[PDB]
Enzyme design. Structure first.
Site, PDB file in Angstrom:
ATOM      1  N   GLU A  22      37.144  45.829  -3.343  1.00 20.05           N
ATOM      2  CA  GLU A  22      37.713  44.597  -3.866  1.00 20.05           C
ATOM      3  C   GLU A  22      38.696  44.853  -5.002  1.00 20.05           C
ATOM      4  O   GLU A  22      39.745  44.217  -5.077  1.00 20.05           O
ATOM      5  CB  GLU A  22      36.597  43.677  -4.339  1.00 20.05           C
ATOM      6  CG  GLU A  22      35.639  43.311  -3.224  1.00 20.05           C
ATOM      7  CD  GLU A  22      34.453  42.521  -3.715  1.00 20.05           C
ATOM      8  OE1 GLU A  22      33.724  43.032  -4.593  1.00 20.05           O
ATOM      9  OE2 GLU A  22      34.251  41.392  -3.218  1.00 20.05           O
ATOM     10  N   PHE A  72      19.356  48.854 -14.971  1.00 15.85           N
ATOM     11  CA  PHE A  72      18.137  49.203 -14.247  1.00 15.85           C
ATOM     12  C   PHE A  72      17.939  50.712 -14.219  1.00 15.85           C
ATOM     13  O   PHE A  72      18.905  51.477 -14.161  1.00 15.85           O
ATOM     14  CB  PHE A  72      18.191  48.723 -12.792  1.00 15.85           C
ATOM     15  CG  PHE A  72      18.649  47.307 -12.623  1.00 15.85           C
ATOM     16  CD1 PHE A  72      20.004  46.999 -12.623  1.00 15.85           C
ATOM     17  CD2 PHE A  72      17.727  46.283 -12.431  1.00 15.85           C
ATOM     18  CE1 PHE A  72      20.436  45.691 -12.432  1.00 15.85           C
ATOM     19  CE2 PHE A  72      18.149  44.970 -12.240  1.00 15.85           C
ATOM     20  CZ  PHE A  72      19.506  44.674 -12.239  1.00 15.85           C
ATOM     21  N   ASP A 100      32.424  35.270  -7.969  1.00 16.04           N
ATOM     22  CA  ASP A 100      31.020  35.093  -7.598  1.00 16.04           C
ATOM     23  C   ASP A 100      30.322  34.307  -8.700  1.00 16.04           C
ATOM     24  O   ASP A 100      30.260  34.746  -9.852  1.00 16.04           O
ATOM     25  CB  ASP A 100      30.362  36.464  -7.408  1.00 16.04           C
ATOM     26  CG  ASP A 100      28.970  36.373  -6.800  1.00 16.04           C
ATOM     27  OD1 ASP A 100      28.615  37.274  -6.008  1.00 16.04           O
ATOM     28  OD2 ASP A 100      28.230  35.419  -7.120  1.00 16.04           O
ATOM     29  N   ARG A 191      21.711  38.224  -1.799  1.00 13.37           N
ATOM     30  CA  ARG A 191      22.148  37.412  -2.934  1.00 13.37           C
ATOM     31  C   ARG A 191      20.977  36.898  -3.773  1.00 13.37           C
ATOM     32  O   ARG A 191      20.980  35.760  -4.243  1.00 13.37           O
ATOM     33  CB  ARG A 191      23.010  36.233  -2.456  1.00 13.37           C
ATOM     34  CG  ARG A 191      24.340  36.657  -1.832  1.00 13.37           C
ATOM     35  CD  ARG A 191      25.248  35.458  -1.568  1.00 13.37           C
ATOM     36  NE  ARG A 191      25.518  34.694  -2.787  1.00 13.37           N
ATOM     37  CZ  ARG A 191      26.345  35.084  -3.754  1.00 13.37           C
ATOM     38  NH1 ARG A 191      27.003  36.236  -3.649  1.00 13.37           N
ATOM     39  NH2 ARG A 191      26.503  34.329  -4.833  1.00 13.37           N
TER      40      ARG A 191
HETATM   41  O1  UDP Z   1      28.265  45.288   5.428  1.00 12.29           O
HETATM   42  C1  UDP Z   1      28.941  44.498   4.771  1.00 12.29           C
HETATM   43  C2  UDP Z   1      28.605  43.136   4.489  1.00 12.29           C
HETATM   44  C3  UDP Z   1      29.398  42.410   3.691  1.00 12.29           C
HETATM   45  N1  UDP Z   1      30.541  42.920   3.118  1.00 12.29           N
HETATM   46  C4  UDP Z   1      31.372  42.117   2.213  1.00 12.29           C
HETATM   47  O2  UDP Z   1      30.525  41.277   1.451  1.00 12.29           O
HETATM   48  C5  UDP Z   1      30.980  39.905   1.568  1.00 12.29           C
HETATM   49  C6  UDP Z   1      29.797  38.977   1.480  1.00 12.29           C
HETATM   50  O3  UDP Z   1      29.341  38.886   0.134  1.00 12.29           O
HETATM   51  P1  UDP Z   1      28.023  38.068  -0.223  1.00 12.29           P
HETATM   52  O4  UDP Z   1      26.903  38.613   0.585  1.00 12.29           O
HETATM   53  O5  UDP Z   1      27.899  38.030  -1.700  1.00 12.29           O
HETATM   54  O6  UDP Z   1      28.330  36.606   0.342  1.00 12.29           O
HETATM   55  P2  UDP Z   1      29.413  35.514  -0.093  1.00 12.29           P
HETATM   56  O7  UDP Z   1      28.781  34.914  -1.302  1.00 12.29           O
HETATM   57  O8  UDP Z   1      30.639  36.324  -0.336  1.00 12.29           O
HETATM   58  O9  UDP Z   1      29.431  34.655   1.117  1.00 12.29           O
HETATM   59  C7  UDP Z   1      31.719  39.871   2.893  1.00 12.29           C
HETATM   60  O10 UDP Z   1      32.673  38.816   2.883  1.00 12.29           O
HETATM   61  C8  UDP Z   1      32.405  41.232   2.916  1.00 12.29           C
HETATM   62  O11 UDP Z   1      33.601  41.222   2.170  1.00 12.29           O
HETATM   63  C9  UDP Z   1      30.941  44.213   3.361  1.00 12.29           C
HETATM   64  O12 UDP Z   1      31.956  44.685   2.888  1.00 12.29           O
HETATM   65  N2  UDP Z   1      30.109  44.936   4.180  1.00 12.29           N
HETATM   66 CA    CA Z   2      32.315  37.673  -1.860  1.00 13.48          CA
END
Ligand code: UDP
Ligand code: CA
Length: 351
Positions: A22, A72, A100, A191
């Protein structure tokens, strides 16, 4: 005009890790709009310069990608500590990229001073006093302000759809027709259970062939409020730059978000899914006004409708291709506004 961008709590090297990916994507998209930017991290590398080898004040703008500041284990996490030491030395405004909701800017000192290794640092060394402007990915600034009510120097807030960087990269390309091996797919982390209700609703006990890829694990789903019997198949995480290709393995890909994301945040997955070969199915609650796509067929209210819609796509290849054509068209409509997006970003960082 020299810009420095850093990740506040994760090392940056390549695309083998998400936070790094990112940060590099942001570095690239900022560079692609004609700006001079450097990524500063722990050590020198292909894309980075070291905190210990540059003067933070040689930069006219300091951009910080949000991160957790929790500690941690044993040894001090230098990714967090060195970044905040770097930030504390900057004498101008800091631009915090808030992508986020769980990662608002916070001072590390309070979480350090009580640690057994606290003696290695000082308050003056870690306390960031510069004014901070939060660039919120969510349009609702009240939610962003509430998240930072604990930090006095965060004095400005502005909404900007940061996450659109995925579709504005010079090398962007839509996924091509892919042989299907899955009905529904969703990639992400647990999450901390902030989205457990929605995950169980749309991904568990559906009777469909569903895969949940990412850092999440079946054993994490045990909240008595959201019981289940049959879980989707969990597979490991994959590189961020391979996500759309992964989504393409399925007929459809799910779009859900945290409660505070509903009608507020348009997340990276919206674009990763829209650009994929998978039909995007969106939780009605996430976008009640259907602002992503004005076509009810892309929205599902609950498990029952998701099952119905997926089977409709399985039964009719024409319906599937028709919907894919529609979502790809709408995606391109947003990509056609790149100039406006770039100008808005520049304005957000006071350029
Ligand atoms: O194996 C994986 C799974 C997820 N992602 C990234 O992690 C994001 C999801 O982040 P999160 O689980 O925090 O969910 P969000 O809040 O972004 O929906 C996806 O959009 C991808 O960019 C990734 O790079 N590899
Ligand atoms: Ca994200």
């Amino acid at each position: 005009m020299k810009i420095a961008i850093i990740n506040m709590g994760n090392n940056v090297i390549n695309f083998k890790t998400v936070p790094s990916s990112e940060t590099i994507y942001l570095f690239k998209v900022i560079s692609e709009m004609g700006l001079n930017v450097d990524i500063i991290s722990l050590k020198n590398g292909v894309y980075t310069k070291s905190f210990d080898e540059v003067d933070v004040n040689d930069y006219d703008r300091l951009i910080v990608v949000n991160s957790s500041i929790n500690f941690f284990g044993g040894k001090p996490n230098l990714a967090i500590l060195s970044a905040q030491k770097f930030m504390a030395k900057y004498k101008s405004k800091i631009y915090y990229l808030f992508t986020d909701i769980r990662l608002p800017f916070s001072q590390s000192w309070p979480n350090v001073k009580n640690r057994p290794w606290a003696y290695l640092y000082t308050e003056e060394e870690l306390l960031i006093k510069s004014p901070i402007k939060v660039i919120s990915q969510g349009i609702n600034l009240d939610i962003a302000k509430a998240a930072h009510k604990k930090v006095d120097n965060v004095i400005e807030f502005e909404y900007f759809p940061i996450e659109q960087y995925k579709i504005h990269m010079n090398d962007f390309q839509l996924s091509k027709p892919t042989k299907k091996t899955l009905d529904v797919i969703y990639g992400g982390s647990f999450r901390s259970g902030q989205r457990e209700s929605k995950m169980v609703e749309f991904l568990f006990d559906t009777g469909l062939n569903i895969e949940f890829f990412g850092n999440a694990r079946e054993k994490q789903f045990k909240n008595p409020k959201y019981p289940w019997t049959k879980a989707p198949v969990f597979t490991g995480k994959i590189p961020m730059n391979m996500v759309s290709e992964k989504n393409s393995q399925a007929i459809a890909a799910l779009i859900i978000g945290d409660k505070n994301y509903n009608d507020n945040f348009i997340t990276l997955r919206v674009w990763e899914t829209m650009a994929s070969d998978a039909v995007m199915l969106i939780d009605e609650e996430f976008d009640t006004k259907h602002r992503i796509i004005n076509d009810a067929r892309f929205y599902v209210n609950n498990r029952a409708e998701l099952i119905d819609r997926v089977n409709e796509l399985k039964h009719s290849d024409v319906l599937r291709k028709e919907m894919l054509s529609i979502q790809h068209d709408i995606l391109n409509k947003t990509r056609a506004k790149k100039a406006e997006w770039q100008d808005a970003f520049k304005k957000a960082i006071d350029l």
